[PDB]
Structure formats: structure tokens, C-alpha cells
Write a protein that binds this ligand. Structure first.
Ligand SMILES: C[N+](C)(C)CCO
Ligand SMILES: C[N+](C)(C)CCO
Ligand SMILES: [Cl-]
Ligand SMILES: [Cl-]
Ligand SMILES: [Cl-]
Ligand SMILES: [Cl-]
Ligand SMILES: [Cl-]
Ligand SMILES: [Cl-]
Ligand SMILES: [Cl-]
Ligand SMILES: [Cl-]
Ligand SMILES: [Cl-]
Ligand SMILES: [Cl-]
Ligand SMILES: [Cl-]
Ligand SMILES: [Cl-]
Ligand SMILES: [Cl-]
Ligand code: NA
Ligand code: NA
Ligand code: NA
Ligand code: NA
Ligand code: NA
Length: 129
């Protein structure tokens, strides 16, 4: 599923991401735009053999299991395929553990390089929340 911008903001809002660990809703919408282009089915293979999954491109190196990342971890206790569903619950639950891990939203490289320090409120402007 390819979400709309305001549609995804509403979904993230009701799942409790607004101001979660201090990060306003606009930071989460901006990250998803540049990580996945709002597509829940996005995947990308990394040079070390891990794979990034779903709307926030969660990495199998640490957070989910796909059976093909030798020596990896499954800290979210979830199959990586569950992060590709049209319902964002699984990604949001795993995202909350990721952001609390110590580096904050810097864990998302596209957030640090394209959203951090910008006017992120413009991503939720005009949305029925
Ligand atoms: C901080 N990392 C996610 C890289 C490892 C956690 O043990
Ligand atoms: C922030 N953008 C202008 C790129 C999206 C519309 O709000
Ligand atoms: Cl899709
Ligand atoms: Cl929308
Ligand atoms: Cl609900
Ligand atoms: Cl904030
Ligand atoms: Cl915001
Ligand atoms: Cl994701
Ligand atoms: Cl293994
Ligand atoms: Cl584990
Ligand atoms: Cl699994
Ligand atoms: Cl949803
Ligand atoms: Cl932080
Ligand atoms: Cl990470
Ligand atoms: Cl507004
Ligand atoms: Na957009
Ligand atoms: Na990425
Ligand atoms: Na893994
Ligand atoms: Na395996
Ligand atoms: Na700013």
C-alpha cells in the first residue's frame, strides 16, 4: 500500500508516535517519505547482506528475522515480512523500540541527512489528525 501523506500522518498519530521520545509527528512523516516513499512494500538490500523492510525501512541486522542475515538479531521479535503489511502496527511498535535505543531518530540515516533540523511541521500541514 502506498499511503497518502496526511493518511499516513493520521495512522502514525493514532498509533502513538506524536511526540514519542520527544519527536514531533512531522519527523516521523518526513522519515517515511524519504525511506519508503510511503510504500509499505518497500525493500532494499544492504551491502553486508541485511535487508531494510517496510514504511520505515527497518533493518534485519538488528530488529527482525528473515532467515537470511547470518548472525543477526531479532530485537523486535517479529518476522521481517510482518513489517510489509498494509497495517502499520508492527512497524510502529518496532520503531518505538528503535528510537528508545540511545541514538534517537539518528538510527534512520535518511532522517539525519534529510529531515533533521528542517521545518518538519510542513509534512503535517493541512491534515485532519
Ligand atoms: C545500537 N545497535 C542497534 C547498533 C545495536 C544494539 O545492540
Ligand atoms: C513538505 N512538502 C512540501 C514536500 C510536502 C507537502 O507538505
Ligand atoms: Cl504497495
Ligand atoms: Cl492523504
Ligand atoms: Cl485505533
Ligand atoms: Cl520534535
Ligand atoms: Cl511536526
Ligand atoms: Cl518499516
Ligand atoms: Cl544466524
Ligand atoms: Cl535477538
Ligand atoms: Cl520469523
Ligand atoms: Cl494503519
Ligand atoms: Cl533523542
Ligand atoms: Cl539501528
Ligand atoms: Cl496545520
Ligand atoms: Na508527499
Ligand atoms: Na535506509
Ligand atoms: Na535478523
Ligand atoms: Na536461516
Ligand atoms: Na526549522
Amino acid at each position: 500500500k502506498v499511503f497518502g501523506r496526511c493518511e499516513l500522518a493520521a495512522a502514525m498519530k493514532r498509533h502513538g508516535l506524536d511526540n514519542y521520545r520527544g519527536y514531533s509527528l512531522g519527523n516521523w512523516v518526513c522519515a517515511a517519505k524519504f525511506e519508503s516513499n510511503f510504500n509499505t512494500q518497500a525493500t532494499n538490500r544492504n551491502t553486508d547482506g541485511s535487508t531494510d523492510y517496510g514504511i520505515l525501512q527497518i533493518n534485519s541486522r538488528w530488529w527482525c528475522n528473515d532467515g537470511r542475515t547470518p548472525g543477526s538479531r531479532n530485537l523486535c521479535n517479529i518476522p521481517c515480512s510482518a513489517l510489509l503489511s498494509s497495517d502499520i502496527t508492527a512497524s510502529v511498535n518496532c520503531a518505538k523500540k528503535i528510537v528508545s535505543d540511545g541514538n534517537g531518530m539518528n538510527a534512520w540515516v535518511a532522517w539525519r541527512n534529510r529531515c533533521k533540523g528542517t521545518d518538519v511541521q510542513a509534512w503535517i500541514r493541512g491534515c485532519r489528525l
